[PDB]
Structures are given as C-alpha cells and as structure tokens.
Design a protein around this ligand. Structure first.
Ligand SMILES: Nc1ncnc2c1ncn2[C@H]1C[C@H](O)[C@@H](COP(=O)(O)OP(=O)(O)OP(=O)(O)O)O1
Ligand SMILES: Nc1ncnc2c1ncn2[C@H]1C[C@H](O)[C@@H](COP(=O)(O)OP(=O)(O)OP(=O)(O)O)O1
Ligand SMILES: [Mg+2]
Ligand SMILES: [Mg+2]
Lengths: 841, 211
C-alpha cells in the first residue's frame, strides 16, 4: 500500500514507477530493505548483482517503494541516477546533470564545473548540507573510476552486473545477490496478468514454456508481452523456445533491449582481449554440470593457482556461478547462459570439441585414469560426450568400445550410464557397428541382475556365453585364449545355441526382497519397493538410477504413481500412507485411518477427482479425498481382508476385491454401496464336506475400457460384468491347484498367469487356450505387470529380480530348458544327460 | 570512540574514512598528535615520511580522527587536499578546486584565478578570515614548487615519501618518520580481521607469511 506521500517523494527522486505487470519478491525486497536499513548513518555502499535481466533494477525501485524503511530512516529524499556505460567525457555530463538536479534553489553557482572532482565537491557538499539524509541509487555501472567519481562519502548504492566494480571504494560494503530464478507459482501469476485470465483458465501449453523461461523474468515479460498481440499463436512460441533460439522473441519494452540474446551480447564485450578467448572454450561445458576445476586446467593447459583467478573474475562478471563445496569448486551456468553460448559460438564448438580431447591425450590415457583423481568422474561421465561432438568415430572406438573402460566405468558409475551413452553412440558411428552395439547391449542384459553386487565375477569368463559372434564375442574368445596359456582354468561352454531364451533386460534395485512395483502412467519409468522398505524409482530404457528414497516407516506393502505421475503413494505396515512427490521426491500428501496394515493404494484414474481408495487387513475400505487430510468415506463391505484395489474408469464407481472373492462395485459418488457380484461361479462338486466352494479372488483385472472386471482365483479366471452384475467370461487355468498370481493383458486377450511355483504361463483369455510357456524366474515369481503400452511387462520375483520382456516373444513356443532334476551317466568321450519330456516322459 | 560531531566536521573536511580493516598504532598516532598540537598558533609545517606503503596516509587520517586534539585545538575545520604528482598545469586546477571548496558561501568572486599566486592569495585570505583555525593536510607531493604554491603562511601539513620536499618552505618544520615495520602481534590482529577468526583458530601457515 503506497502512501500518497511516498509517491510525492519518489516523483522528486525520479525513480521509474514499477511496470504495471509486476510480481513482488517479498523475501528479496525484505532482505535488501532490512540490510539497506543497516547503514543507519555514516557512509556506506550496497551492491546488488545478477546475470542479465534478473529483476535487479525493479527490486531497487521496489525496495524504496515502501513507506516504512524510507520514511523513518530517510529524512533525505532519494535520488536515482542512470549511469549506464560511459567514456570519460560522457560520465562528466551526468555529474553536471546531477548537480543541476540536486540544486533546485540555484543558490550555488549557475556555472558548472569542468572538472570531475569539483562536481564531486558539489555533490558531497550538497549531500552534506542541502540533503542531509539522502540516498543515491545507481543503475548499471561498468567500471571502477565511475564509482571513484561518485565516491562522495555519502551513501550511494549501485546495482549492477559486475561485483568487482565496488573495489576501489572505501567504507562498509554489503552485497545482496539476485540469482535469476523466479517461482513457478509466480510466473503463472505473471503470465496471467500478461494475458488477463484466472490462472486455471490458462491453457495447458502455458505450464511448459515457463520451464524454458528458467525464471528470467525478462523472458517471461518478453514472452508475455509478445503474447498480448497474438493470443492465438500460443504453442508456436512454446516450440520456439524448444528450438532454443532467442532471435525469434522480440518486444519493444521499458527494458533496454529487443531480446534476451540482446542482453548477453552486451555482457560479453567488456572482457579484456586476453580473457575473451577463454570464455569461448567455456562454451563447451554442459548446461548442468558442476565441473571440477582441474578439467578446465587441462583444456587451458595453464597452472591451477592461476586458472581459478580468471574464473573468479568471471564469477564477478556474473557470467559463471560459483560453487564453494569444500575445497573443491564447481562452476556452472544458467540454462539461458548456455543457450546463448551455442547461439553465439556454435561453429567453433564442433572444432574445439576436438581440442579438449587431444590435451587429455597429452595427459592421462583412459586406461591411465585413476579413482582418486577428482576430475575422472567427469571424464567417465562426459569424456564420452566430447568425442561425439568431435565427430571422430575411430577415436570413439578407441574409447567407448574398450571393455576394460566399461569395467572401470561400471565399477564406480554403475551399468546405466553406459547404456544411455550407447543410444547416443549409435547415431554417431556406423550402422554396421550398431550391430556391435546391439551385441554389447545383449551382453549387458546379463550384466544388470548380478553384475553390480561386488565380487565383480571375472567378466572375461562370464562373457564367453553370447551367441553368433559379432564383435563382442570375437573379443572374448581371444581374451580367453590369452588368459589360458598363463592359467586361470577357464571352462569352455559348448551348449549355448541349444540353451537359454534370453530376456531383454534384468534389474536388481534392492539387496532386500522386492514387495511391489509399478509403471509410470506415461510408461517412461518404473518404481519398485522391497523388504528393506526403501523404494527406488527408475527409467527403464537406459536402465539408470533416476530416484533414491531414503526410507519408508515399516516394510513397504505397495506403492503407485499418480495418474499424471506427479505423486507416489506408498503403503506400509506402519500405516504411514506417504505420498511423496514423483519429481522433487519430497513428501506431499500423507494419510492414515486403517485399523490394520494397508492392503493396497491407488490414485484415481480420473484426471479430475483426486481420491485414494485403500484396502487393508481390517477389511474396511478407505476412500480418501486426496484434497482433504481426512477420508472422504470409510467403506465397510468385505467380509474378508481386501486382496486388491483399483479405481474404475468411471470415477463415480469404485470396484474392490477381497478373500471372500465377491466383487464389490461401490458407488463412490453417493459414498454408498451400488453393486456387488457374488462369486461362486467356480462351481466344483467335490467330496469336500464344505458346500459350494468359497472363491478367493486375487487380481482385480480390468477390461481395456474398464467396463467389466476380469478376475482370477483357484483354478479359473473369470470375466464378470459388474455393470449388469452377472458373470460372462471364464478362463480355466492350467490343471488344478489354487492361483498364487495372475495378470490379464488387454492386448491379444493375453493372460500372463503365475499359477503356482513360478508357473508363469501365457494363456489367451476368452479364447481360453494357452499361448506359450515362460520359464526363467528363480524363487517362484513375486509379481508381474504389463506396460501401459502393453508391449512389455515387468516380472518381480523372490530372488530380488525384475525381468523385462517383449510381448512378441512369449507367444512363440520354446520347448526347451530341461527339467530341474535329472540323472546323467558318463561313459567316456560323449556325456548323456537324463531328461524329462516337456510334455510327458 | 568517535564523537558524532567529529564525523560531521570530518565529512566537511573530506578526509577519507579509515579502512574497515585497520589496527591503531597508538604510539605513532599519539606522537604525531602531540607534536601536531605543538604549533598551537602561527604558521608551521609537519612532514611525515616512509618507504612506500608504510601507513603514511592512514596515520594522517587517524591522527585527526580523534576529538581531543582536534576539538579544543582546532576551531577551524580540517581540509584535506590530494596533491598527487603534477605538471604545472595540473597543479593549477587543484588550487581552483580548493578555492571552490573553501568558499562555500560564494561571496568571493565566482571568477577563478588564472594565476597560481592569485589562488595563493585566495587561500591565505580565506584561511585568515573565513577559516581562522584551519589545518590543511596534503597527500604525497613530489616537488618543491608545489609547496611553494601552498605556502600560505597558514599551517599545512604534507605527508609523503621525500623529506627533501619541504626545504623551500619557511617557518618551523618538524618531521615524524614512519619506519615500515608493524608488529607481529598486530599483523596477526590484522590477519584475523581479514579472515574473520579468533586469532588462535588461525592456521599454522599464517605465522610464517607475516615474516
Ligand atoms: N515483478 C517483477 N520483478 C522483476 N522483473 C519483472 C517484474 N515484472 C516484470 N519484470 C520484467 C520486466 C523488465 O523488463 C525486467 C526488469 O528489469 P531489471 O530487473 O531492472 O533488469 P536489469 O536492469 O537488472 O537489467 P540490466 O542488468 O541490463 O540493467 O523484468
Ligand atoms: N591500521 C592500518 N594502518 C596503516 N595501514 C593499514 C591499516 N590497515 C590496513 N592498512 C593498509 C591498507 C592500505 O592500503 C595501506 C594504507 O595506505 P597508506 O599508509 O596511506 O599508504 P601511503 O598513502 O603512505 O602510500 P603512498 O606513499 O603511495 O602515498 O595500508
Ligand atoms: Mg538496470
Ligand atoms: Mg598517500
């Protein structure tokens, strides 16, 4: 709330009025103001700095905008001077102009000084007597002599880009440093003002462009104004910033530059010619890597004590952010700063990409690399990167191919980064090699499951298992031959082509037994928990750690993603329903209500309604309202503990299952019962004294539309029609027993069912016939589930193993993998192994 | 303990405020001040000198920094002039600038002298009537004609590197000579302020560099 008076003082001062489209930064303004308060008396300078367009001026204008700090503190008026960038002559005029401005009375000589110092005298004297408690604010400022000129011994605060500038000056100096960030909540606030609509009314496109903005309010205002003219071309600029070129965005504005690219160019020029060349080398560095100083030493080839200082000069130029982590320093850039570089240095970059590598060659060889050296991890993680830009494919073969390099990389990096590199790798080299890469990836499929542990089993020995030959196998045989003469007692294997139907991928997330896993709704990533109760979240493709979760109270019981993959509910024995964020990984929602341990958790399939249906051992359902701390509706109904829980495609409905086996299609909208099919459909007239059998449904499978409920229990799958409250389908399972696990597939009407003893058969629903056997999990499976695409499925298991599988492979028959117990009799040169037929004898 | 008033006189004078990271040299400051006290009246020049960077200016600023010697002794304000090194033309401007500084009222002619001596007259007259008990401090100074110019018959103290400089001048002259030494105890005091830690907390390395 501006006082009328405040505006009157401010008008005299001449500070610009804040732009009509602004958004307070309360914390920052408060900090400057409280600090600004600090030099209650006696000279003093305040410096404020940021990379270009960080809200640096507006804050200065805003800080003084308030009555409290200004009025009590500052009986003297406020004077603003726009210094800009100046040659000695230009600077002189500003001084005279400030002279004329300050002396409104004109009592002082009408004649103006021709000498800077004399003007300094007129300022000091005027500040001393004419305006006793005045504060002076400066804009920009690019060189020290300038502040030397203004160094009146009276408080002046300069706001800028370089923080080096106030080094000539004397007296207490404080700096408030404005990082260019902003807030996602705030920018939406800003965007709304720019286009004038309730924030929600804002289009889906809007959220994403702000991510590009990276909080440079200059970009937001720049996009925002740009949109005022053309509300229709909303996506266009989204893809434009996806392009990464800022030449497209331009607006005339109060701000002094057509565009964001425009601002950066102004910063670059100042550096002394010797420094100037160096920055470009700095261009190569990743958008988001804090590189250890050394690598910069290597590229430069200049000694370390020296190298740091030039970088220190940069940090002051606010062109490269500091990182005081321990003795080590990692410097890094804003996404905007990096983008500008490629925009202005792109032709060089391909050329330099080859410069860095040769220098590294003049020092450490990749085999000559060591674990202790600080730089090396950057070298693993990104050296691979530079060679790619280099465009040198033979050199790329000289590095990435090297199996020992893979060994060391998998020693401290893990086996995910290499896979990610390989995908990049494939385009870079040759199609024929691509096969070699295909052979290596195939060699990795066997790596993930047990490779990481510790006893890094002599790969050279475990390698000789691949089929065909390719380039990976060729390497192995020769290595083995080399090993063999010396010793090492390697045993050759002669049956590979006769054995093993290889899975596409295997993951061990936890040393401790897995309890549940779930696909991202997008299908881009998967989360598995375990007995330890830590949950690990990962992106399956490149198969590389994408999330670590510290702990969950009590052993995890199950977990699941939000429909937009923005949340992760976590069920537990403790009863701590910890809904952690899926991105930041920080906790958001949390719930408890169950009398017993939770059986299942799930977010609403509807994008709109936010509910958390939860079964538990107490038999009670708990239909949480995710928007409220307490439950939307407790739902007693099941006569037995809940076996599984899922939201129905109709969010108004809420189906549930339990050991009684009866389906229960609840009416969530009325918070009351609607339908509940009985399940005695598994008719079986045994000599058992019990009457009709008490079916115990487990999985609560859905039709792809979700209009009907597939289920499975005992010896039969069923397809109940809950909307009509009657049975329809009924897919009998293999032989007779009692189902331990089951899983319907909406594609091809498939049914991957683990009956008992990891009997993970691939049946076909409705057609009611098996498609193909699936041998290969140890410990009797613990669980399976299909990809949202349905083209693949995870296979959690008691071993602690998750095997990825293609949909196509399962259907094809593979009468192999001999029976578990056999007797073999050896009569000399050929050995015969006893076998049990896959079907009969 | 600076009086609030002292700062008010000092601001008008224009002496720089002492660097935030400083360490009193009580004996030296005391000597200059007691000596500085000595020319209670009637002209007089004081020379202070040392090899480069001996704390020569800071002492000058520091000596006057105190209330007692300044307030009772010096009803006239203190004026500081930064002479530097000058060709004849350059020197001329400083004089006019001192003219403009001293004559805040402007009662004296707005026109400025084109001749050094005339400026000398404006200084002497201004010192004589406008500021009766004023002390002038100079910074550096590298040649005699310069002090010849400032030789107003009113106390001016010049602080420098050459001690030959005040030979042209007339009237009582005293010199306080600052050897560049400092104290090991003090530098540790200074180093602590520079890095902000209890002196003991300071690393083993620190002791040796001071040597
Ligand atoms: N509430 C707000 N706070 C900060 N900036 C805002 C706000 N609303 C809009 N903006 C945009 C519009 C302005 O062009 C810009 C503010 O300019 P400012 O932060 O003073 O840049 P600057 O003056 O630091 O740049 P330079 O470093 O080139 O001087 O940010
Ligand atoms: N308490 C202190 N006393 C003296 N010098 C200090 C003190 N604290 C820090 N210093 C350092 C910082 C200053 O750069 C320097 C003081 O400068 P000064 O002694 O005036 O040199 P000077 O002006 O005699 O040099 P020149 O002969 O070139 O004019 O000493
Ligand atoms: Mg500005
Ligand atoms: Mg000096």
């Amino acid at each position: 709330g501006i006082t009328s008076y405040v505006r009157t003082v401010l008008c005299e001062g001449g500070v610009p009025q804040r732009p009509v489209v602004f958004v307070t930064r309360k914390k920052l303004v408060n900090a400057i103001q409280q600090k600004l308060s600090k030099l209650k008396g006696e000279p003093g300078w305040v410096t404020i700095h940021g990379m270009a367009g960080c809200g640096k001026s507006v804050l200065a204008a805003e800080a003084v905008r308030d009555h409290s700090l200004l009025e009590g503190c500052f009986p003297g008026g406020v004077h603003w001077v726009s210094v800009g960038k100046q040659d000695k002559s230009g600077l002189l005029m500003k001084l005279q102009n400030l002279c004329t401005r300050l002396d409104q009375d004109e009592s002082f000589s009408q004649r103006l000084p021709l000498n800077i110092e004399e003007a300094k005298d007129r300022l000091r004297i005027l500040m001393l007597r004419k305006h006793p408690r005045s504060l002076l604010i400066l804009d920009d400022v690019w060189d020290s002599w300038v502040l030397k000129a203004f160094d009146s011994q009276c408080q002046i605060l300069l706001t800028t880009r370089d923080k080096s500038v106030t080094d000539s000056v004397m007296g207490p100096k404080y700096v408030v440093p404005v990082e260019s960030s902003l807030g996602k909540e705030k920018g939406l606030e800003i965007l709304s003002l720019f286009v004038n609509m309730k924030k929600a009314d804002l289009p889906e496109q809007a959220h994403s462009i702000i991510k590009e903005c990276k909080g440079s309010p200059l970009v937001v205002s720049l996009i925002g104004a740009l949109l005022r003219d053309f509300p229709n071309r909303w996506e266009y600029y989204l893809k434009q910033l996806q392009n990464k070129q800022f030449k497209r965005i331009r607006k005339s504005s109060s701000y002094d530059y057509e565009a964001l690219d425009e601002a950066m160019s102004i910063s670059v020029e100042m550096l002394r010619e010797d420094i100037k060349d160096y920055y470009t080398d700095l261009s190569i560095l990743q958008k988001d890597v804090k590189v250890p100083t050394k690598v910069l030493c290597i590229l430069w080839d200049m000694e370390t004590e020296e190298v740091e200082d030039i970088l220190q000069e940069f940090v002051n130029k606010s062109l490269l952010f500091c990182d005081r982590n321990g003795k080590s320093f990692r410097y890094y850039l804003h996404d905007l700063q990096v983008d500008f570089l490629t925009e202005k240095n792109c032709s060089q970059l391909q050329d330099l990409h080859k410069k860095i590598i040769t220098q590294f060659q003049r020092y450490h060889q990749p085999h000559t690399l060591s674990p202790d050296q600080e730089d090396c991890m950057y070298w693993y993680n990104f050296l691979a990167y530079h060679m790619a830009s280099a465009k040198m494919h033979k050199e790329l073969c000289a590095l990435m191919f090297s199996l020992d390099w893979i060994k060391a990389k998998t020693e401290l990096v893990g086996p995910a980064h290499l896979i990610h590199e390989f995908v990049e790798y494939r385009h870079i080299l040759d199609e024929k090699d691509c096969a070699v890469s295909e052979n290596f990836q195939e060699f990795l499929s066997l790596n993930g499951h047990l490779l990481g542990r510790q006893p890094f089993p002599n790969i050279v020995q475990l390698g000789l298992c691949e089929p065909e030959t390719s380039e990976v196998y060729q390497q192995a045989k020769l290595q083995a031959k080399q090993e063999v003469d010396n010793g090492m007692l390697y045993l050759e294997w002669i049956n590979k082509k006769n054995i093993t139907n290889l899975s596409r991928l295997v993951v061990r997330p936890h040393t401790d037994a897995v309890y549940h896993a779930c696909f991202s709704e997008d299908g881009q990533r998967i989360a598995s928990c375990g007995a330890d109760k830590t949950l690990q979240v990962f992106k399956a493709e490149t198969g590389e750690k994408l999330l670590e979760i510290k702990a969950h109270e009590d052993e995890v019981l199950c977990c699941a993603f939000s429909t937009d993959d923005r949340f992760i509910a976590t069920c537990s024995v403790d009863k701590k329903v910890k809904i952690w964020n899926s991105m930041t990984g920080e906790l958001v929602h949390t719930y408890d209500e169950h009398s017993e341990q939770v059986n299942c958790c799930h977010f609403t399939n509807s994008s709109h309604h936010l509910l958390l249906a939860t079964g538990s051992s107490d038999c009670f359902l708990k239909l949480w309202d995710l928007n409220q701390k307490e439950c939307r509706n407790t739902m007693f109904g099941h006569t037995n503990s809940v076996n599984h829980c899922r939201f129905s495609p109709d969010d108004k409905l809420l189906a549930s299952c339990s050991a009684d086996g009866t389906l229960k299609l609840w009416d969530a909208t009325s918070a009351n019962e609607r339908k509940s099919i009985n399940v005695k459909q598994f008719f079986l007239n045994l000599e058992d004294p019990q009457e009709d059998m008490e079916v115990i449904v487990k999985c609560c499978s859905w039709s792809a539309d979700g209009a009907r409920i597939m289920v499975a229990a005992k010896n039969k799958i069923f397809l109940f029609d809950i909307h009509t409250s009657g049975l329809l389908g009924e897919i009998h399972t293999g032989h007779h027993s009692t189902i331990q696990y089951c899983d319907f597939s909406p594609q091809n009407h498939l049914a991957v069912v683990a009956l008992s003893q990891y009997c993970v058969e691939l049946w076909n629903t409705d057609s009611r016939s098996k498609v193909a056997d699936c041998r290969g999990h140890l410990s009797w499976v613990h669980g399976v589930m299909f990809s949202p695409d349905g083209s693949s499925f995870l296979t959690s298991s008691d071993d602690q193993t998750i095997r990825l599988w293609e949909t196509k492979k399962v259907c094809k028959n593979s009468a192999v993998m001999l029976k578990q117990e056999v007797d073999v009799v050896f009569q000399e040169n050929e050995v015969m192994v006893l076998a049990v037929d896959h079907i009969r004898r």
